[PDB]
Design a protein around this ligand. Structure first.
Ligand SMILES: Nc1nc2c(ncn2[C@@H]2O[C@H](COP(=O)(O)OP(=O)(O)OP(=O)(O)O)[C@@H](O)[C@H]2O)c(=O)[nH]1
Ligand SMILES: Nc1nc2c(ncn2[C@@H]2O[C@H](COP(=O)(O)OP(=O)(O)OP(=O)(O)O)[C@@H](O)[C@H]2O)c(=O)[nH]1
Lengths: 350, 406
């Protein structure tokens, strides 16, 4: 069985972070999210994956041609001249997704879940139809596309969102066109009028992590599943509250309170007396003393000064220097900005 | 010999200074460590020939005022008396009502100081000018910005004889750059126009600026004496912070042992900082510019304190940031809590300074000013109070921003 990953589409949600590294390469709990999906795929038994790649091609060349030796499987990159929707992937890669006449996975990259691939091939071989998708019950249906098929109902026609995982047999492969169409919007509409796609629901822990608030909620849910499945992964100690995922390279000072749902990247320096809750601190980001952070994303190589209160989904891009004794509330700071004045309003710093 | 009359107000003049005035009277609020009228009594007892200091007001003598009066009498080697007027008599009506007690012993001249002003009080130089010229009214004037001068009492003078030709208490239009400072030197003859004013009232309450300064302006009685040393008014609860900063800057000349030095094994000190000796400040607590610490104040480790007044008995737990705030008496600010305000000084030479009006709101929005905490306010851990006024005895549980917490 082969697999397809969709990747490259500009991350226009998660926008300060996705001007620096692509959306697959944002390290979600000390591991890139494309690395999450391909390690679960290579453990699921797929021998060959194809990454549709259009945006920021060269850094994904580097990461994936360096990780192919780590996973043990094969990865074929399919680069395009144009960013071609969500289905132009399959129509460029039609010649090697119809190699063997097998059903193939189609994965969104912004989805992190308990990947139920083994049960899902079993599901797919029982209705005999062409495509079968992963669905998830969501207790607020107006923001989300439920599945009949609609895309933005906001009506409560159904309750369960699409979870970004599909299996497609190769009859849909020479069905779609090369010029850009998005496979979830209008390919799936005639797929529904055909009667060929099916719905399979999983038990829990789904998150789309394309938006920064959703990125943080996915961090909280993933740290819960990492508490349950692998409790040796999480940190422990007196100054540690909740589920804290410290990298071995990351160093934390003394009399801190590194509270629940914190994931420190490789190489972070948290100084003496920081209080972090619900944050994601990425690689090489130094957080100075007597700062207080809650529900924020500190990007790569930022310096947070001292007595800095950051909160309410403040997202710092790459290499952002927050000066001392400032207060940020919803600042979505672009890369290579220094900040000298407080931001008490949800704002975008240019 | 001379004497001084400090016109303290009463409880209605302290209404504008309300969060702070709930506990202590306004003239006893500690501005840069000592009460507001102790700067006046300091500056008056420094004059050779000062017999008496007479506070006139309609406060009732409670425990803090009479204990302050005995403490001032011991500390300043003078009789400091408090003349309680039977009614709110205005500015000059209490000076006319107490003229028998003011002129008792026949002083050569007497000072009249408003209690709500912060100044260097150039009383010696005012006395030099008075003993040169010998006129009924000597006023102290400062130069203001042309835009800011409309908030104050404007004085049009004659720059050769220095005679006030015109006085207006708060003009709608531009009049002059000279503003009244609320410091005056009266000779005994100055109590004769006030009598006239009082007699005209019978066909008791005399406003000194509207009835005496504006009436005799240009007739030869009223004269200016100009300065540009430090001057501020203290009207609202947050102009006490600007007055505290100016006083902490002039402690570099008058009391340099009040200012705290770095001393590497102690707390890290930037700018001018007053720390009372009874206060315990942890050595990692950096106390930034223009901070004054009351007595009995336990400041924890990593506490950043900048541009603030922490009053008696307050407690700042670990890693707190307190900026442009006034922490009330006995208030406790739990760990990683941030009490932040916005600098808003009167400053009559600042062209961007606000009018210091009594309306704190523009249109439903609280204008960004100093964050006042009343007495006994418990600010919980990990919480932000931003540009807020908290009324006394309020235990909070929540972050507050641009709100008056009643
Ligand atoms: N190769 C390629 N991949 C694409 C293209 N368009 C979208 N994708 C992929 O589609 C995947 C999931 O779609 P989205 O979740 O909406 O992400 P997105 O493409 O960044 O689009 P936004 O909604 O603007 O964030 C992304 O990882 C993209 O890499 C494309 O034109 N070419
Ligand atoms: N003893 C005494 N002092 C007073 C009285 N009223 C005011 N004062 C003092 O004199 C100062 C004058 O304050 P205001 O009465 O507000 O007069 P103003 O400063 O000319 O300003 P306006 O309110 O526009 O008239 C006050 O700040 C007090 O220090 C009073 O009735 N008795």
């Amino acid at each position: 069985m082969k697999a397809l990953i969709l990747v490259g589409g500009y991350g226009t949600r998660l926008r300060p972070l996705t001007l620096s590294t692509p959306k697959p390469l944002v390290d979600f709990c000390n591991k890139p999210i494309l690395l999450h999906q391909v390690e679960a795929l290579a453990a699921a038994g797929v021998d060959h994956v194809i990454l549709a790649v259009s945006y920021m091609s060269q850094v994904l060349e580097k990461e994936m041609k360096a990780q192919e030796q780590r996973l043990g499987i094969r990865i074929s990159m399919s680069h395009e001249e144009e960013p071609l929707g969500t289905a132009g992937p399959l129509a460029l890669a039609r010649d090697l997704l119809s190699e063997t006449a097998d059903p193939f996975f189609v994965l969104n990259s912004d989805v992190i879940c308990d990947f139920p691939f083994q049960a899902m091939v079993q599901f797919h071989r029982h209705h005999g139809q062409e495509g079968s998708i992963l669905v998830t019950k969501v207790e607020e249906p107006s923001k989300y596309g439920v599945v009949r098929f609609v895309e933005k109902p906001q009506v409560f026609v159904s309750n369960k969102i699409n979870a970004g995982m599909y299996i497609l047999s190769p009859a849909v492969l020479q069905r779609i066109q090369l010029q850009p169409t998005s496979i979830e919007k209008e390919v799936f509409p005639i797929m529904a009028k055909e009667g060929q796609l099916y719905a399979m629901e999983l038990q829990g822990f789904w998150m789309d992590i394309g938006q920064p608030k959703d990125f943080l909620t996915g961090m909280c849910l993933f740290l819960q599943s990492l508490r349950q499945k692998q409790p040796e992964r999480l940190c422990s100690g007196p100054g540690i509250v909740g589920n804290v995922l410290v990298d071995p390279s990351a160093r934390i000072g003394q009399n801190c309170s590194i509270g629940p749902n914190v994931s420190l990247g490789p190489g972070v320096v948290v100084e003496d007396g920081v209080c972090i809750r619900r944050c994601t601190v990425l690689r090489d980001a130094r957080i100075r003393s007597h700062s207080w952070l809650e529900s924020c994303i500190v990007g790569w190589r930022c310096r947070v000064g001292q007595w800095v209160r950051m909160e309410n989904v403040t997202v710092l891009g790459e290499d952002v220097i927050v000066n001392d004794e400032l207060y940020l509330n919803g600042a979505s700071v672009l890369p290579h900005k220094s900040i000298g004045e407080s931001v008490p309003e949800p704002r975008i710093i240019m | 010999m001379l004497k001084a009359v400090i016109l303290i107000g009463g409880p209605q003049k302290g209404t504008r200074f309300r969060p702070l005035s709930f506990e202590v009277p306004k003239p006893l609020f500690p501005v840069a460590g000592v009460p507001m009228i102790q700067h006046h009594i300091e500056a008056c007892a420094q004059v050779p020939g000062m017999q008496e200091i007479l506070l006139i007001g309609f406060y009732q003598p409670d425990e803090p005022l009479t204990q302050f009066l005995e403490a001032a009498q011991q500390e300043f080697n003078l009789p400091v008396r408090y003349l309680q007027e039977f009614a709110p008599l205005g500015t000059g009506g209490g000076l006319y009502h107490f003229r028998d007690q003011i002129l008792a012993g026949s002083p050569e001249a007497f000072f009249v100081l408003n209690a709500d002003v912060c100044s260097d009080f150039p009383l010696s130089a005012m006395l030099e000018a008075h003993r040169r010229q010998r006129h009924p009214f000597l006023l102290l004037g400062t130069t203001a910005n042309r835009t800011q001068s409309l908030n104050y009492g404007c004085i049009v003078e004659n720059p050769q004889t220095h005679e006030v030709l015109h006085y207006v208490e708060k003009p709608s239009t531009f009049i002059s750059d000279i503003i009244n400072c609320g410091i005056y030197l009266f000779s005994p003859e100055a109590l004769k126009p006030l009598r006239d004013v009082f007699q005209r009232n019978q066909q008791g309450t005399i406003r000194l600026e509207q009835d005496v300064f504006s009436a005799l302006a240009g007739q030869g009685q009223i004269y200016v004496h100009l300065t540009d040393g430090i001057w501020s008014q203290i009207k609202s609860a947050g102009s006490a912070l600007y007055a505290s900063r100016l006083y902490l800057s002039r402690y570099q000349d008058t009391h340099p042992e009040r200012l705290a030095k770095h001393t590497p094994g102690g707390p890290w000190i930037r700018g001018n900082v007053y720390i009372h000796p009874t206060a315990k400040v942890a050595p990692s607590a950096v106390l930034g510019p223009n901070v004054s610490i009351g007595k009995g104040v336990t400041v924890g480790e990593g506490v950043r304190l900048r541009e603030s007044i922490v009053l008696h008995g307050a407690t700042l737990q670990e890693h707190t940031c307190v900026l442009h705030s006034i922490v009330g008496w006995g208030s406790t600010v739990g760990r990683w809590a941030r009490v932040e305000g916005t600098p808003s000084d009167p400053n009559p030479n600042d062209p961007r300074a606000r009018m210091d009006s009594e309306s704190l709101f523009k249109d439903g929005k609280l204008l960004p000013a100093i964050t006042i905490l009343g007495c006994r306010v418990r600010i919980p851990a990990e919480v932000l109070i931003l540009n807020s006024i908290v009324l006394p005895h309020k235990e909070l549980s929540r972050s507050f921003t641009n709100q008056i917490i009643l």
